RNA sequence: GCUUGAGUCUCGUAGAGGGGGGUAGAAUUCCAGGUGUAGCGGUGAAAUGCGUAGAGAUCUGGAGGAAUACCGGUGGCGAAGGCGGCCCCCUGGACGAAGACUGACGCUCAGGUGCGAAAGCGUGGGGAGCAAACAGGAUUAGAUACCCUGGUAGUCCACGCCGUAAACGAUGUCGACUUGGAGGUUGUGCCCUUGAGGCGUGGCUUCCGGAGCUAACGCGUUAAGUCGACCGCCUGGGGAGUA
RNA sequence: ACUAUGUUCACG
């Protein structure tokens, strides 16, 4: 139904899990009609300030179409999970490509 | 919100004369053509037309003698909030009979001077000095 | 909010065709459609007084169209209310 | 100078910080329109994108961290 | 704010501070600026600005100086 | 809702009832009920140890489940029931296997909702977990003070503990008193808040409402004679002695805490 | 009957419009510890106040609560009250583009209903900062004040009540008509985007001025000009918006 | 820094 733009950050030691993390978040959305348009793993990028007393967070950009039930279920999996240091979910205005 | 169309006509004439404007366009009507022609026939307005089929726009052409305008003053008398119907003998004479009062009588729209001689009164629309 | 399919469904049913979309029959139904969607919004929230003013505009607007329709024709006025579930 | 370009239009996005870091001062604050040109519309899109970039620690809030 | 000035120089030169903050932290968030009073004291600082700028166009008088 | 009763009689005037519309109207599940005879405040020796208790309505004990022993087994909430033995309400939980048990009803709960408990499970209101597995800065209740025991802390209507911090094997809990107590991380805790939060807005209204709750009248020391209570005597409303219990110990600001054993666990005393 | 009034449908644009739920960073306060050695704090000048029990300053870790620097403007949105970190959920309206439809469905509105800053009030929370009352210290002829150090209701949230403000453009609502200029802001079309262009036509808006109006000050296409519809209100000052 | 008051009617 609606387009989104998820940009979440992950802790250094659990960056090896991120390949596994993406495959679970894809499987939740890809089944329910809307496809993921563009993923792009950013990598272990430096932080502008220390979050949780550490530097270097592992950024991941999904950008995906989904209904409201699946996206809010994905929104809850970030809060009830110590690996993910912050995330945000933006709104529609069509699909996009490139840009970093 | 546009309750009296006739008062609006007489403002466009009044404000057009203040602005020193040549012509005055507005939406037309049955009562608009009747008043506009009576003003023309005596000689406040210098010619007019009713150009249009579906959405007619009656435009007047205002008269000027000197730098001053011809229509000294013009005002609504029988406004819709208070209708004013005067009897034959009780008909007014604007500016002691050298200005006219447009009066809707039973034999069509006419001046106060013609109403006296024709032998009838009616709704006094507007004084024109 | 009323989606494109929701309005177009009501428009191509009460009126003549999808082309016709301004009739008092159509207009009242679109308001009744939005008003009934807004009841679930004002079930909770409650303090949303600014949206209520938009609703009470739609409510009053609907009464003016129905009061117009009644004076215009008593036949189609009564038939419209039986289908929409107004009068109460 | 002004906006993006002559035939740019586009939208000011938070992800890119190379072109975005020009619009903030050395302290970390957002630079006003009366200094850097920019129309009121694109300054508001910019100001929002700075604040979103700050949430993700792409840009810093300040320089006392 | 973070000003090193290489090595041979010293002599302060930290206008970076004075032309950035200081006034914002101090003579503003020192004591209570009563919500309304800014709306008053700005709109009079704003009215005094265009008063000068409109006068600056008409400042070219005879003078004879 | 919290419905105020109309003043059709003096005694009715001030009554405020807590009318829960979702509770079951009928007899309870017998297998979990049992007899609960009253003490009247007296003990082995037959003597009034606790004053002001005696009488009231007869009331049976429901075997409520504080331990929550069922691991990895889903359980459907069949119906919310009234409990006379408690401030809070209870929920008749039907486990997927066949068992039925009474548990304390949290806030967000109705007849039809599903609850799971154990080690894994999901983070949701009603789902019992070890406190290690629960996220820090979350609302819990029915909290154990020892691993494998029942559940001591936050069981009354609207009561809840908040998990403040998590130091390795220990969990710092901020209790409803305001006391910050350190408990073991292996201990369990039921997520969310204990239901029936309107309970506190009930106001009884009459003397007999306290008498049919099993309370008896509290005579003031000042009203008594000097032989009875330390406050006593005087020819017409005297006092002039410092406030005290019937046994001379000072009330009104006098710390009676003297455990010593569990003073290590208390991170900070209430205020 | 008709279509220019009024309303509906399509498509986009902007916005601190609203309600509910999250979370972010700076700071402030207190809490625990490290460092450390006499002051700190304040003021017109002092004192009360905190400090050799080791304060202030400095660092580290924690808990809280409230408010969102810069962007931010004679900027925007809202009927008014009013509304500013960032993100999703539901949601009201506004404006533009060219059509299609309805066919006067409109404008005002006594009674009536709804919303309505702040301070209050009730009940349950919450309480860092600030701060009526209150206390102490100065000031003073006196100081129930102004200044200083403390500091409770309150200020914050949920649910109701209150129904007032210089609730102010001190300017009722709707519509028509009548020289300009300089901006801001948001649209939309036509050529070359042939280079941050231009050239047009719509909304909202700040400033200066023409005729005209005004007791004057001033207002001046957003009139206080020129007219129409309807409403509210006024009839010397005190008494009194009181009995 | 703080810093009070000027009896009544008249003369213009
Ligand atoms: Mg004709
Ligand atoms: Mg026609
Ligand atoms: Mg015709
Ligand atoms: Mg009925
Ligand atoms: Mg009904
Ligand atoms: Mg009826
Ligand atoms: Mg009924
Ligand atoms: Mg203000
Ligand atoms: Mg039995
Ligand atoms: Mg017993
Ligand atoms: Mg015995
Ligand atoms: Mg015995
Ligand atoms: Mg006892
Ligand atoms: Mg007792
Ligand atoms: Mg009992
Ligand atoms: Mg008692
Ligand atoms: Mg007693
Ligand atoms: Mg007693
Ligand atoms: Mg007695
Ligand atoms: Mg006695
Ligand atoms: Mg005895
Ligand atoms: Mg004794
Ligand atoms: Mg006695
Ligand atoms: Mg005696
Ligand atoms: Mg006695
Ligand atoms: Mg006595
Ligand atoms: Mg005595
Ligand atoms: Mg004693
Ligand atoms: Mg036709
Ligand atoms: Mg039209
Ligand atoms: Mg129209
Ligand atoms: Mg539409
Ligand atoms: Mg739209
Ligand atoms: Mg928008
Ligand atoms: Mg936008
Ligand atoms: Mg907005
Ligand atoms: Mg908003
Ligand atoms: Mg809002
Ligand atoms: Mg709320
Ligand atoms: Mg909100
Ligand atoms: Mg933080
Ligand atoms: Mg404190
Ligand atoms: Mg220290
Ligand atoms: Mg030392
Ligand atoms: Mg002294
Ligand atoms: Mg001293
Ligand atoms: Mg000392
Ligand atoms: Mg020491
Ligand atoms: Mg200290
Ligand atoms: Mg310190
Ligand atoms: Mg506290
Ligand atoms: Mg404004
Ligand atoms: Mg506006
Ligand atoms: Mg508005
Ligand atoms: Mg904002
Ligand atoms: Mg917030
Ligand atoms: Mg909406
Ligand atoms: Mg709209
Ligand atoms: Mg048509
Ligand atoms: Mg027709
Ligand atoms: Mg037709
Ligand atoms: Mg009246
Ligand atoms: Mg009224
Ligand atoms: Mg009200
Ligand atoms: Mg208030
Ligand atoms: Mg209160
Ligand atoms: Mg009271
Ligand atoms: Mg109450
Ligand atoms: Mg309390
Ligand atoms: Mg209170
Ligand atoms: Mg309290
Ligand atoms: Mg306090
Ligand atoms: Mg408290
Ligand atoms: Mg203070
Ligand atoms: Mg003070
Ligand atoms: Mg008081
Ligand atoms: Mg005092
Ligand atoms: Mg003095
Ligand atoms: Mg003296
Ligand atoms: Mg003194
Ligand atoms: Mg005093
Ligand atoms: Mg004093
Ligand atoms: Mg009081
Ligand atoms: Mg809130
Ligand atoms: Mg509140
Ligand atoms: Mg009321
Ligand atoms: Mg008033
Ligand atoms: Mg105001
Ligand atoms: Mg104002
Ligand atoms: Mg205004
Ligand atoms: Mg007024
Ligand atoms: Mg008004
Ligand atoms: Mg009105
Ligand atoms: Mg009205
Ligand atoms: Mg007008
Ligand atoms: Mg012009
Ligand atoms: Mg202009
Ligand atoms: Mg322009
Ligand atoms: Mg303009
Ligand atoms: Mg140009
Ligand atoms: Mg315009
Ligand atoms: Mg203006
Ligand atoms: Mg004006
Ligand atoms: Mg002005
Ligand atoms: Mg002017
Ligand atoms: Mg104009
Ligand atoms: Mg003009
Ligand atoms: Mg203008
Ligand atoms: Mg015009
Ligand atoms: Mg105009
Ligand atoms: Mg106007
Ligand atoms: Mg304009
Ligand atoms: Mg006017
Ligand atoms: Mg006037
Ligand atoms: Mg009156
Ligand atoms: Mg009156
Ligand atoms: Mg009088
Ligand atoms: Mg009155
Ligand atoms: Mg009053
Ligand atoms: Mg009164
Ligand atoms: Mg004196």
Coordinates of C-alpha atoms (C1' of nucleotides) in Angstrom, one line a residue, chain B residues 4-18 24 26 31-32 35-36 39 44-45 58 60 62 71 73-79 100 102 124-128, chain G residues 176-177 226-228:
Chain B
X4 CA -29.6 44.6 -4.6
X5 CA -28.3 44.5 -8.2
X6 CA -29.8 48.0 -9.0
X7 CA -27.8 49.8 -6.3
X8 CA -24.7 48.1 -7.5
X9 CA -25.3 49.5 -11.1
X10 CA -25.7 53.0 -9.6
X11 CA -22.4 52.7 -7.7
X12 CA -20.5 51.6 -10.8
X13 CA -21.9 54.7 -12.5
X14 CA -21.0 56.9 -9.5
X15 CA -17.5 55.4 -8.9
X16 CA -16.8 55.4 -12.7
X17 CA -17.5 59.2 -12.8
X18 CA -15.2 59.7 -9.8
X24 CA -18.7 50.8 -17.2
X26 CA -21.6 45.0 -15.6
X31 CA -34.6 46.3 -14.9
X32 CA -31.0 47.3 -15.8
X35 CA -33.0 52.2 -15.9
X36 CA -30.0 52.6 -18.2
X39 CA -30.7 57.8 -17.9
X44 CA -26.8 61.5 -18.2
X45 CA -25.3 58.6 -20.2
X58 CA -24.4 45.7 -20.3
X60 CA -22.6 52.0 -20.3
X62 CA -20.4 57.8 -19.1
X71 CA -23.9 62.8 -12.9
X73 CA -25.0 62.6 -7.5
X74 CA -27.0 59.4 -7.8
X75 CA -28.5 57.3 -5.0
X76 CA -30.9 54.4 -4.3
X77 CA -34.2 55.3 -2.7
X78 CA -36.3 52.1 -2.8
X79 CA -33.7 49.7 -1.6
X100 CA -35.0 63.2 -12.1
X102 CA -36.5 57.1 -11.9
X124 CA -39.3 55.4 -6.8
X125 CA -36.0 53.5 -7.7
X126 CA -33.3 56.2 -7.6
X127 CA -32.8 60.0 -7.4
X128 CA -30.4 61.4 -10.1
Chain G
rA176 C1' -20.1 44.5 -5.7
rC177 C1' -17.2 48.9 -7.5
rU226 C1' -18.2 54.5 -2.9
rC227 C1' -23.1 51.3 -2.1
rG228 C1' -26.2 47.1 -0.7

